[PDB]
Amino acid sequence: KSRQKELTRWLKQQSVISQRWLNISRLLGFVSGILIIAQAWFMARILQHMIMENIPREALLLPFTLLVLTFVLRAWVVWLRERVGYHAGQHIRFAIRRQVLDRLQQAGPAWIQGKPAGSWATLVLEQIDDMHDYYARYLPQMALAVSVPLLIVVAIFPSNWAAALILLGTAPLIPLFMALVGMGAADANRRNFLALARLSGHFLDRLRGMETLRIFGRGEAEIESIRSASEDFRQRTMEVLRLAFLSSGILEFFTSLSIALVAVYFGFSYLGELDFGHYDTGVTLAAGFLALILAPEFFQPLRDLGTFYHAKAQAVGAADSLKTFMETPLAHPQRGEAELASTDPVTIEAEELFITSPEGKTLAGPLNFTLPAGQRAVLVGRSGSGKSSLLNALSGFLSYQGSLRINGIELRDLSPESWRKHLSWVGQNPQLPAATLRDNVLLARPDASEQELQAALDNAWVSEFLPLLPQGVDTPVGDQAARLSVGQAQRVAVARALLNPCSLLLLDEPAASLDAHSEQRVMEALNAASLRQTTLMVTHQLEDLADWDVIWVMQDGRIIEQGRYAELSVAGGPFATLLAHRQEEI
Amino acid sequence: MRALLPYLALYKRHKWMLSLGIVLAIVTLLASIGLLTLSGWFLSASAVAGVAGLYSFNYMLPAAGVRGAAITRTAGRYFERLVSHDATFRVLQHLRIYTFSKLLPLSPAGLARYRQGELLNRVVADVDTLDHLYLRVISPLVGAFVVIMVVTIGLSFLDFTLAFTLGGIMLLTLFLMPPLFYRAGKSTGQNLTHLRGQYRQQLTAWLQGQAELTIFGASDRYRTQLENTEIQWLEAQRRQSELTALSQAIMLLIGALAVILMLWMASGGVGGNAQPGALIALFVFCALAAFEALAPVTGAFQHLGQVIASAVRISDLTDQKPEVTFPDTQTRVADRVSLTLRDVQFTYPEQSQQALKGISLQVNAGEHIAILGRTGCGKSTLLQQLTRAWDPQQGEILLNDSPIASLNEAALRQTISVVPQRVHLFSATLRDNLLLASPGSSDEALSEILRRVGLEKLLEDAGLNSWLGEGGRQLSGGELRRLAIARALLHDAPLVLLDEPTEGLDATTESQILELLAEMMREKTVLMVTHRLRGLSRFQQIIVMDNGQIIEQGTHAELLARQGRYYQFKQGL
Ligand code: ISW
Ligand SMILES: Nc1ncnc2c1ncn2[C@@H]1O[C@H](COP(=O)(O)OP(=O)(O)NP(=O)(O)O)[C@@H](O)[C@H]1O
Ligand SMILES: [Mg+2]
Secondary structure, eight states, X not given: OOHHHHHHXXXXXXXXXXXXXXXXHHHHHHHHHHHHHHHHHHHHHHHHHHHTSOOOGGGOHHHHHHHHHXXXXXXXXXXXXXHHHHHHHHHHHHHHXXXXXXXXXXXXXXXXXXXXXXXXXXXXXXXHHTXXXXXXIIHHHHHHHHHHHHHHHHHHHHHOHHHHHHHHHTTTHHHHHTTTSTTTTTHHHHHHHHHHHHHHHHHHHHHHTHHHHHHTTOHHXXXXXXXXXXXXXXXXXXXXXXXXXXXXXXXXXXXXXXXXXXXXXXXXHHTTSOOOSSOSSOOOHHHXXXXXXXXXXXXXXXXXXXXXXXXXXXXXXXXXXXXXXXXXXXXXXXXXXXXOSOOSOOOEEXXXXXXXXXXXXXXXXXXXXXXXXXXXXXXXXXXXXXXHHHHHHHTTSSEXXXXXXXXXXXXXXXOHHHHGGGEEEOOSSXXXXXXXXXXXXXXXXXXXXXXXXXXXXXXXXXXXXXXXXXXXXXXXXXXXXXXSOHHHHHHHHHHHHHSSOOSEEEEESTTSSOOHHHHHHHHHHHHHHTTSSEEEEEXXXXXXXXXXXXXXEEETTEEEEEEOHHHXXXXXXXXXXXXXXXXXXX | OGGGHHHHGGGGTTSHHHHHHHHHHHHHHHHHHHHHHHHHHHHHHHHHHTTTTGGGSOTHHHHHHHTHHHHHHXXXXXHHHHHHHHHHHHHHHHHHHHHHHHHSTTTTTTTOOTTHXXXXXXXXXXXXXXXXXXIIIIHHXXXXXXXXXXXXXXXXXXXXXXXXXXXXXXXXXXXXXXXXXXXXXXXXXXXXXXXXXHHHHHHHHHHHTHHHHHHTTOHHHHHHHHHHHHHHHHHHHHHHHHHHHHHXXXXXXXXXXXXXXXXXXXXXXXXXXXXXXXXXXXXXXXXXHGGGTTSSHHHHHHHHHHHHHHHHHHXXXXXXXXXXXOOOOOOOOOSSOOEEXXXXXXXXXXXXXXXXXXXXXXXXXXXXXXXXXOTTTOOOOHHHHTTTSSOOSSSEEEETTEEGGGSOHHHHHXXXXXXOSSOOOOSEETTHHHHTXXXXXXXXXXXXXXXXXXXXXXXXXXXXXXXXXXXXXXXXXXXXXXXXXXXXXHTTOXXXXXXXXXXXXXXXXHHHHHHHHHHHSSSSEEEEEOSBOXXXXXXXXXXXXXXXXXXXXXXXXXXXXXXXXXXXXXXXX
């Protein structure tokens, strides 16, 4: 029925990862109930001697020592139960994080780039960590809320059965007051947390666009918009909370009534007004103190369960995002077992190719190209025409439902691990993932000779700007290669691709938004590199494509024109229109 | 601690709701202590009385105090949760408004820090953490202090020694124990922050570069160190819970020490009484119940360090100097704007030349202008100083024969309508994304713009009510540019600044948009920076220039006639 029930159900199905830790915490919480009963028994015993029998405190050293010993044991069990609770939640987060990263690597870059890199760190770091206090604290506490209270009654019932019924009488009442209206306002509370997180995205939306609010003079009208949005959330939340806080207040009433009723019953039983509830052996002062000391701890596990409310609330919201993430169906590219015989330039073939997104959407329409071995081809067209999809499909990142044969062998049947060793790629965005600039170049093979590193650095013209770096080739690129500019970070990506020989080189607009100097050095290295094997280059620099022997004009996901620059520039077709539009950029 | 003063002064707006929520927390805690203390005394008082004292006990007064302490504990708990939650949302609203008001005058320059989008997600998280100062820090600590004092004061009417040793133990562990555990875990909380950002740094690299790592066969060995950082990160969290387990076992040992001391000391005499019958239970049951107030004080002080760390971060941003100030004078916005530039640096200095004399452009009251630069040579920053993002350090920017700096902020935004390169799609309705330009405008007049600017596609399903931005219906560059032009048309300003229009667009949308400017902004002075030689024949007085210096200028025919730099643009490249 409720969404919050299939999310709390999902949370408990994840709790079996650490069930040994949850069973120890349940066993240690039962030991706490015994030590709470024993602690209250030595207090009640001592107080009776000191009040009724007027026994001096110096003759009560044995009960005092046993009371100190049972307090130290109580503190030890809390220490043990708190450390065991952490282990329960840590091993669950470690296993869910592994499942998220496993499922995020199987999907591949085709699905990772759907959301911003910050949207994935939120799911992995912040949202998986929001479940810890639910497994570390809330689940151990909700097991304590049934173990200790039913153990208190078992200890009071032998001494007096009327004090046991006072506590046990409110035992089923409390559950039907926070489950009649509490469940009614539990999913409403879950929606209020979604509204608070959505209201937090309305604030971030206004912060991200203050450059647009400034130029239009809407600064003083978005302060009111923040005020109106914040007042609407509070007004809506406080109407729900007027019912959700009844459970907190009702539980405080029944612990007040039970303490009062225990005091009234025992107090008037000593005065002789009442003569029931005992076994005709007479009510003692230790019997009344035992019930009165233990009356607060009958409700304390339930009163501490309301303290841990946000542990469950912030884990249900986290489980909301992690349940849909783990249950969206993705279309992975089929992987085979075949391997390519030789490292010579491959031949690419297509026959009614249909590139498909992981969500099932068709990216590129029917492609029927053919790239002989060692031949350098160019993909051109307007933005969103499927040029990067064709390169991503050849890389094995996208699934297709046509024919795409490498050296006569289908790409489904090729083993992805061994196919990509016959493959070098540059990509539209550099994305240097290693630590330093040297480790980024050596990403293809870290254990390569120093001479070969210098050969790749010189060919890609990375060596010329190395003196400008503070540390040289060992300069850390930092967060997203912020240390070095895009034009000189693209040359590190070029040196990375040229370090190892390949059978097919895929270039995805390698000189898109570089400065005019890196334009020269990248195309200097990449025009020479395109001659050594089969190459497929996506570009909009249509003036330089004179010596490339094949040009594909891709529009609407379909190759609509083929030929060389000599015959395509003058044919007055789709490429001439693209060339004419390109001639206006200065 | 001194960092929180600016944000404590924000509490003055709601000081009766914020102080009622602390008073209600104090009253609720005192009713829990006063109920168990009265109940403990009543048992031992009625036991020593026995059957003989049945008719001379006067139980009516405790009966009025046991029902009194029960109503104020169930109604005090209900309203303390209600009042302190309303109050929390009141200061969150006032923190969001205060931060937004301080961040806006310094929006372009003082806020453009490295990875601005990642900064703003950290600004919003800090505003949330400052909102936690009331319920998670101030209320537990102030409530515990007042409860201890009231208990100590009210329990001293029976015995000064017993009340001061009970209140002394509770005051020592309120003032000495929370600081001790914060200091103990300070080092473990520093590498926990170091290892958390190291994991986020390594995860982002491993996720963004998943295409590069799979092709070059490194995705397995870079996840190995990513999972090795988590092991170290999870180890630091284990040592942080190893200290929270200690602060809960020591709280139980201290509350045990108070009970043992009350049991031992109150039996030797409460006040002058040699044998206090019912007064031992009054002190023992006070020590049992009074330590409920001290439960949150160690975790409240722990969160105070997080709140302080957020208070310096927010104060670092907000307390910056807005480099642009606007006079408070009412001016009449003219129907014609004659923009003239005198010795103004059209582009931020490149290669530290420091000798680039400012340009001397002059735009008449109704004429279009196109500044033709070169791509990648230098970012414009001309429409930035023309919207007063910062003051021009080079020369004078006069706006209709008057300086731009002598214009009211409200009147400056009504005389200039700029379309930027980075057009923002607010997470709101399409109507709200367009009421931005004109705040009072008919719904049909709003819809006429969409059809007029070639955006009829957005009126198909839930037109003018569809959610744009993160909610859904994302737009591409071709149609997102049209929305920016749509804003500049509702914002009926005499001067329009076109920032790189038709950039990254196809040849079909560019022609549809350049024709839009030439027919929509016919009566307005536009100032367009393109580096694209398309449609410039309709722009009179083309300004072609390089190195931040005007090479030559004039109408399109005049540029071609003289066979200069502009002629090589069309003739060569
Ligand atoms: C963010 C800001 C904030 C904050 C800060 C806060 N918050 Fe809260 N709640 C509670 C409680 C509480 C507390 C106490 C605990 C302890 O002691 O620890 C505290 C402290 C706090 N809380 C705080 C309850 C019940 C529980 C019982 O008792 O049973 C409920 C129901 C609810 C709800 C809610 C909502 C809607 C849904 C919302 C939104 C919100 N909320 C918010 C918030
Ligand atoms: N993984 C994906 N899931 C869904 N849609 C996608 C995905 N990748 C690309 N698309 C869309 O499919 C169409 C083709 O995109 P793409 O193959 O990137 O074209 P492109 O010509 O490379 N674009 P560009 O580099 O900007 O010039 C566009 O609508 C894309 O936004
Ligand atoms: Mg692409």
